[PDB]
From a paper:
DEPTOR-mTORC2 overall refinement (map 1), focused refinement on symmetry-expanded protomer (map 2), and focused refinement on one protomer classified for the DEP domain tandem (DEPt) region (map 3) were used for modeling and illustration. (a) Composite map of overall and local focused cryo-EM reconstructions of DEPTOR-bound mTORC2. The core architecture of the cryo-EM reconstructions of the two mTOR complexes in association with DEPTOR largely resembles that of their DEPTOR-free states. In the mTORC1 and mTORC2 complexes associated with DEPTOR, the mTOR active site adopts a non-activated conformation and is not occupied by substrates. Inositol-hexakis-phosphate (IP6) was recently found to bind to mTORC1 and mTORC2, albeit without clear activating or inhibitory effect, and its binding is undisturbed in DEPTOR-bound mTORC1 and mTORC2 complexes. Consistent density for DEPTOR is observed in two regions of the FAT domain of mTOR for both mTORC1 and mTORC2, in agreement with a regulatory effect of DEPTOR on both complexes. DEPTOR binds to mTORC1 and mTORC2 in virtually identical manner via its extended PDZ-linker and DEP domain tandem (DEPt) regions associating with the FAT domain of mTOR. (b) This substrate recruitment site on the FRB is occupied in mTORC2 by Rictor. We have previously shown that the core substrate recognition regions in mTORC2 are flexibly disposed, explaining why substrate interactions are not visualized in the current type of cryo-EM analysis.
DEP domain-containing mTOR interacting protein (DEPTOR), conserved in vertebrates, modulates the activity of the serine/threonine kinase mammalian target of rapamycin (mTOR), a master regulator of cell growth. mTOR acts in two functionally distinct multiprotein complexes, mTOR complex 1 (mTORC1) and mTORC2, and DEPTOR is the only protein reported to bind and inhibit both mTOR complexes. DEPTOR is a 46 kDa protein comprising an N-terminal DEP (Dishevelled, Egl-10, and Pleckstrin) domain tandem, herein referred to as DEPt, and a C-terminal PDZ (postsynaptic density 95, disks large, zonula occludens-1) domain. Biochemical analysis and cryo-EM reconstructions of DEPTOR bound to human mTOR complex 1 (mTORC1) and mTORC2 reveal that both structured regions of DEPTOR, the PDZ domain and the DEP domain tandem (DEPt), are involved in mTOR interaction. The PDZ domain binds tightly with mildly activating effect, but then acts as an anchor for DEPt association that allosterically suppresses mTOR activation.
Residue numbers in the entry:
A (entry chain B): 2236 to 2392
B (entry chain F): 733 to 857, 872 to 1005, 1423 to 1448, 1479 to 1494, 1510 to 1536, 1607 to 1694
C (entry chain B): 1973 to 2182
D (entry chain H): 2 to 36
E (entry chain F): 25 to 488
Write the structure that this text describes.
């Protein structure tokens, strides 16, 4: 029996609503990679970098940055929420690294609407289990992508 | 003819002197349907005493008609004036003999036919009304003179012993039990019919049979016959002692007031009839293993398991007919591979994989499906196991283009 | 109270006996509290997974073991608890409804598995899987349609409480006045997902919905 | 109803199928001659 | 073919039985087709015997056995026809079963090669085998009949109803073989998807017959065989066919309800079904009444139509006002048989003027009194009150009329003891005179009593 946390929505659904409103396909980046190389899943390590790097260059990742501003009633509230978001994601990144959390896909990442905090759910893979699996072993301590790092502040991370 | 019914239900003045006489002339009409319709509306009019006396004084001839005419004629025995007229040419004695041998049991058929037409969608070649047909024993007990004949013949003892000792094994002797229950119920429909019926203590026997009976049809039959017993005030008192209630008002007034009765009776607790004793269910009383670790080609680099000399098309004729023994390691490993795919096809878990495996064998080795013994083994397995229709049609179809020369050679020799 | 009920419901005999011994001691000073917790715990777990939910997971797991691992003794032990609950009789309309639609197939398939334990013929076990797989296909076609549940249909004992002395789960501190369960909403919504979680809304003693 | 004895049940089965079948098969397969 | 009919019987016997094998050479299939017809004609003249018809019975079967393996459908059809005229007694039939001919008889049942004329001949032979001796029916033929009936609808098989009619006949004379092969489950699943009134009545009658005699109830389970027909109404999400097209999914539910409704009605008109569905323990009737109280709109509208047909009451029109629905139930409503072209007065006067019978027992009222008593015992009246005060506007009106009909039926058919506490309605009356409950629920109950009272006046007036 898991408690229900109010005023929070998952990151995957948050981006989906923004893109569909702006007449933007949900998987533009995925389509470009398949168009350039249909056998993306079978490419070698060096070849996947070329396809992956090409996709992120032809599409500008700022959906989360603009999303947090359009939902702010004023500029004073916008700055307060952004500050909380930046220093709440950093806490879970280091704590999650020690615990060894894995499988941090966007569906398991929730952002608080009223305060801008970051909440993590589904603590299933711990103690580096996901890194040692033979099926798609992820090799990243935590989730820090271009979408998140473009919303904390303009100067970077 | 159909318009004489509305003049009957509207209580037209003096209908019993000019209306009844018009239904006797119409009874001899040329068309059967018109004559049959006249009997239907005439039986309804006979329920009034004034109308019934009119027919007796006219003494019509109803013997030439069918069973409808015979039943209408039997109602004359309920009146002492009509009983003397009939019991003067030697008629009641003939009916008693005929009502014990020939169609005593056919009265049950008349009961069942009306119910089956009412609500079954059977139609033997909107709420209807099903009224109890006229019965000889139920009309002879209205007057004491008629009741005397029923007792001297000693028919009550014959019927009562059939109820206390029922044989619920043969479907023909069960109908005799029904032929007795419906006969006992009509006798108890009158006060003078209950005096000679309760002296042998038969009513509790029916009550026991109405709640503890192996055959459920007999259990439901007793409910109807217990209604006929409750047609009198005296009869309802007997049932009340045994925790059976009944309605104590007639149908002439549709708003009864608690201070002739219609036949209806139900137990105080309805669950006393719906109890049935439980009866236990009757069901309560190799190459396959080695194949999964190897391949068909790897192993290559008697086979029939359930093959005995009683369930084979060719092997069974060695002794009875006189056939010759069949003739033939490469081919013995193909029988097991074919057989094991048949068993795995009985689960339908992976039909495509198993069907693909059998098609390849028929292409690479088309001659393996040409032995009668293998077909007998497959046919035997199709009986014990269960297969889906598309899968069952897939088997027995790879064997369409076969010759079976062994059977042809042997059959020709023994026949010639 | 909550951890003890979980321990008392464990499969292990040692944990089961030890947990019950502690429970009966608490019955002296507070008997009505443990009785309510046992009723609530049994009903909540019943709502979480229904009879057709258990069989869908059980048959899918059993099929993988038999056809992937080729283990026969391990397949039966998976399905033994599933057939065990059907012998105790349905306690609600939903369980009664399941026992009519798929009751005959599941009970007959058990009989064929019983003959394999004695005869040992492979055909008996294969014929048993003809009924298990047929029911599995039927259940899999109605799982997506399940989108809402009525308390009367699944567990009538939950909406007839109207009052409880048991605290709301997940909120209890000795330094704060306690809040108890007042009522349970008569309808709960099922979230469309692979696990299909339910949305249970309680009612606190102070008028705050949890 | 009193559909108890097999005599009337057999008649009912072979009458309903013949009368109420769209396909002309029961009229040819349920011939009373074969008894 | 030239029928000789001149030489001796053994001489005439040799020719056709020699050309039937032919070693698949030197003889055409056309000649074999004509030779088989000669055997049937010859068998009509000389009676069935082993002393006059040349060889013994066993030799004739062997040569006749090599006629069903031909690749021509006409020859196989003729070969099956000859066997029908040959099997007359159990001695001949047992000799045929000894040679395992059933492996070939069942083969011709399911080949589906545009041989509908051949398949009719095979099925007609099966009915001959059952009549001669039903206790020795082979299990190979039985399993073929179950397969073509259990899964004969998805394959668009046209001879599907002709095979179910044979299983039911076999299930009455040898239930043991049918029970083992799961033949009783096939009949139960057929009534779910058979929306023909006459056929559905016949199928359910056969199963109820097995529950009648004490020595046959051992072949039917307790609470899972007969209660299968209640699944469409008891289960809100019922899937009868694991594989079906999703295009007619909405239509499939409507077909299931209509077919299941004719099954529940059919089992409540037989004594073998009333008792089994109303056992003192857990029964199907309690589940059927219990599901009525659940606030579901699709089930409730379906169940009310069932209840009207069980008691054989006229269905009102769909509306949201009681007055419009009340005018459609009056016995004096106009009918199409009352015109001048049809019965002018005699047809009309039958349903208005009352019958001249005050003492003749009515066997139909006895049936309804027992049925009504069973539902009241299980709690039908309490269920209807919940439906009236907790449903949609157009559903409560249908339930109010049904409640009014039962009360009027119960004060003239049921005995006093059953109905002395029936007209008070303790549950409905307390929801009326209660100011603690929400006002919307209170006035729905109060309005129900006013509407129900006006129904009483309609019966008081009578037909006009
Ligand atoms: Zn052999």
């Amino acid at each position: 029996l898991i408690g229900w946390v109010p005023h929070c929505d998952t990151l995957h659904a948050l981006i989906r609503d923004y893109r569909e409103k702006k007449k933007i396909l949900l998987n533009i980046e995925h389509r470009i990679m398949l168009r350039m190389a249909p056998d993306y899943d079978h490419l070698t390590l060096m070849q996947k970098v070329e396809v992956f790097e090409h996709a992120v260059n032809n599409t500008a990742g700022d959906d989360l940055a603009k999303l947090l501003w359009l939902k702010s009633p004023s500029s004073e509230v916008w700055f307060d929420r952004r500050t909380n978001y930046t220093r709440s994601l950093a806490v879970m990144s280091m704590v999650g690294y020690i615990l060894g959390l894995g499988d941090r896909h966007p569906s398991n990442l929730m952002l608080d609407r009223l305060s801008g905090k970051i909440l993590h759910i589904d603590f299933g893979d711990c103690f580096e289990v996901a890194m040692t699996r033979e099926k798609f072993p992820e090799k990243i301590p935590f989730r820090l992508t271009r979408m998140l790092t473009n919303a904390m502040e303009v100067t970077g991370l | 003819t159909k318009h004489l019914r509305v003049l009957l239900r509207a209580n037209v003045e003096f209908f019993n002197n000019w209306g009844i006489e018009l239904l006797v002339t119409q009874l001899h009409d040329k068309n059967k349907t018109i004559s049959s319709e006249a009997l239907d509306i005439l039986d309804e009019a006979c329920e009034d005493k004034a109308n019934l006396h009119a027919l007796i004084q006219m003494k019509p001839a109803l013997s030439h008609l069918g069973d409808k005419g015979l039943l209408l004629l039997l109602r004359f025995l309920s009146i002492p004036k009509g009983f003397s007229y009939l019991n003067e040419r030697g008629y009641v004695a003939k009916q008693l003999e005929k009502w014990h041998r020939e169609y005593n049991s056919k009265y049950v058929d008349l009961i069942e036919e009306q119910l089956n037409e009412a609500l079954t969608t059977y139609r033997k070649p909107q709420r209807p009304h099903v009224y109890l047909p006229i019965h000889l024993y139920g009309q002879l007990v209205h007057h004491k003179t008629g009741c005397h004949l029923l007792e001297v013949q000693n028919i009550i003892t014959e019927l009562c012993r059939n109820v206390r000792t029922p044989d619920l094994d043969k479907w023909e002797e069960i109908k005799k039990l029904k032929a007795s229950l419906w006969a006992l119920g009509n006798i108890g429909s009158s006060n003078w019919g209950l005096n000679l019926l309760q002296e042998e203590n038969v009513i509790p026997d029916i009550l026991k049979l109405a709640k503890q009976c192996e055959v459920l049809s007999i259990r439901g039959t007793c409910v109807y016959v217990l209604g006929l017993i409750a047609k009198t005030k005296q009869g309802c008192d007997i049932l009340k002692c045994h925790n059976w209630d009944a309605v104590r008002h007639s149908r002439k007034h549709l708003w009864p007031v608690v201070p002739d009765y219609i036949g209806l009776a139900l137990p105080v607790d309805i669950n006393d009839i719906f109890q049935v004793k439980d009866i236990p269910y009757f069901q309560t009383k190799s190459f396959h293993l080695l194949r999964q670790q190897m391949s068909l080609t790897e192993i290559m680099n008697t086979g029939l398991q359930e093959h005995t000399d009683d369930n084979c098309l060719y092997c069974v004729c060695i002794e009875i007919l006189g056939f010759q023994p069949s003739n033939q390691m490469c081919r013995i490993l193909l029988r097991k591979e074919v057989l094991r795919l048949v068993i795995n096809l009985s689960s339908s878990v992976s039909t495509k994989c198993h069907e693909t495996g059998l098609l390849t064998i028929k292409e690479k080795y088309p001659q393996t499906f040409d032995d009668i013994c293998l077909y007998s083994e497959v046919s035997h397995l199709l009986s014990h196991c269960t297969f889906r229709l598309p899968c069952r049609r897939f088997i027995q179809e790879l064997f369409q283009d076969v010759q079976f020369l062994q059977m042809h050679e042997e059959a020709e020799a023994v026949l010639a | 109270i909550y951890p003890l009920t979980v321990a008392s419901k464990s499969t292990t005999t040692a944990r089961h006996n030890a947990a019950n011994k502690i429970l009966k001691n608490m019955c002296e000073h507070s008997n009505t509290l443990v009785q309510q917790a046992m009723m609530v715990s049994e009903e909540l777990i019943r709502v979480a997974i229904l009879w057709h939910e258990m069989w869908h997971e059980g048959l899918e797991e059993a099929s993988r073991l038999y056809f992937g691992e080729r283990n026969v003794k391990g397949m039966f032990e998976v399905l033994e608890p599933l057939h065990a609950m059907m012998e105790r009789g349905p306690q609600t309309l939903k369980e009664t409804s399941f026992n009519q639609a798929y009751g005959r197939d599941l009970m007959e398939a058990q009989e064929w598995c019983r003959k394999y334990m004695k005869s040992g013929n492979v055909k008996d076990l294969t014929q048993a899987w003809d009924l298990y797989y047929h029911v599995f296909r039927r259940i899999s076609k109605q799982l997506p349609q399940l989108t809402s549940l009525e308390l009367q249909y699944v567990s009538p004992k939950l909406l007839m409480c109207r009052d409880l002395e048991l605290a709301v789960p997940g909120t209890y501190d000795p330094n704060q006045p306690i809040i108890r369960i007042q009522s349970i909403a008569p309808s709960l919504q099922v979230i469309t997902s692979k696990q299909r979680p339910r949305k249970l809304t309680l009612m606190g003693s102070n008028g705050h919905e949890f | 109803a009193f559909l108890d004895n097999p005599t009337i049940i057999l008649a009912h089965i072979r009458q309903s199928h013949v009368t109420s079948d769209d396909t002309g098969m029961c009229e040819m397969v349920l011939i009373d001659h074969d008894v | 073919n030239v029928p000789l009919d001149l030489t001796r019987e053994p001489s005439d016997n040799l020719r056709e039985i020699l050309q039937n094998v032919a070693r698949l050479q030197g003889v055409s299939n056309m000649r074999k087709l004509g030779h088989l017809n000669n055997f049937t004609k010859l068998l009509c003249d000389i009676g069935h015997s082993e002393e006059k018809l040349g060889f013994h019975y066993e030799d004739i079967i062997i040569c006749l056995r090599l006629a069903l393996l031909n690749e021509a459908k006409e020859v196989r059809a003729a070969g099956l026809r000859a066997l029908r005229y040959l099997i007359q007694d159990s001695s001949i039939l047992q000799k045929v079963l000894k040679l395992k001919v059933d492996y070939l008889i069942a083969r011709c049942i399911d080949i589906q090669q545009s041989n509908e004329v051949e398949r009719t001949q095979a099925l007609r032979l099966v009915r001959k085998m059952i009549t001669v001796n039903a206790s020795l029916f082979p299990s190979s033929v039985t399993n073929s009949l179950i397969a073509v009936g259990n899964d004969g609808l998805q394959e668009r098989d046209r001879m599907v109803r002709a095979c179910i009619a044979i299983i039911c006949e076999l299930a009455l004379q040898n239930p043991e073989v049918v029970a083992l092969r799961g033949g009783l489950n096939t009949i139960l699943k057929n009534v779910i998807d058979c929306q023909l009134s006459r056929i559905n009545e016949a199928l359910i009658t056969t199963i109820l017959h097995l529950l009648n005699h004490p020595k046959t109830r051992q072949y039917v389970r307790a609470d899972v065989e007969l209660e299968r027909i209640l699944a469409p109404y008891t289960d809100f999400h019922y899937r009868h066919s694991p594989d079906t097209a999703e295009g007619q999914l909405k239509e499939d539910r409507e077909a299931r309800f209509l077919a299941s409704k004719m099954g529940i009605i059919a089992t409540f008109r037989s004594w073998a079904g009333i008792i089994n569905l109303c056992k003192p323990g857990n029964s199907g009737i309690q589940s059927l009444i219990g599901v009525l109280c659940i606030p579901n709109m699709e089930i409730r509208r379906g169940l009310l139509e069932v209840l009207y047909d069980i008691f054989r009451l006229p269905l009102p029109v769909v509306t949201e006002e009681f007055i419009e629905a009340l005018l459609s139930v009056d016995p004096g409503r106009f009918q199409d048989s009352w015109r001048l072209s049809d019965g002018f007065v005699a047809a009309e006067a039958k349903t208005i003027l009352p019958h001249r019978a005050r003492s003749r027992p009515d066997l139909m009222d006895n049936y309804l009194a027992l049925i009504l008593s069973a539902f009241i015992r299980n709690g039908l009246l309490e269920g209807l009150v919940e439906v009236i005060t907790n449903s949609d506007d157009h559903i409560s009106v249908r339930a109010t009329i049904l409640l009014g009909e039962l009360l009027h039926m119960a004060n003239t058919i049921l005995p006093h003891s059953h109905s002395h506490h029936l007209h008070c309605l303790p549950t409905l009356m307390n929801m009326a005179a209660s100011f603690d409950i929400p006002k919307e629920k209170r006035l729905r109950a109060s309005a129900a009593l006013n509407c129900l009272k006006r129904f009483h006046e309609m019966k008081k007036r009578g037909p006009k």
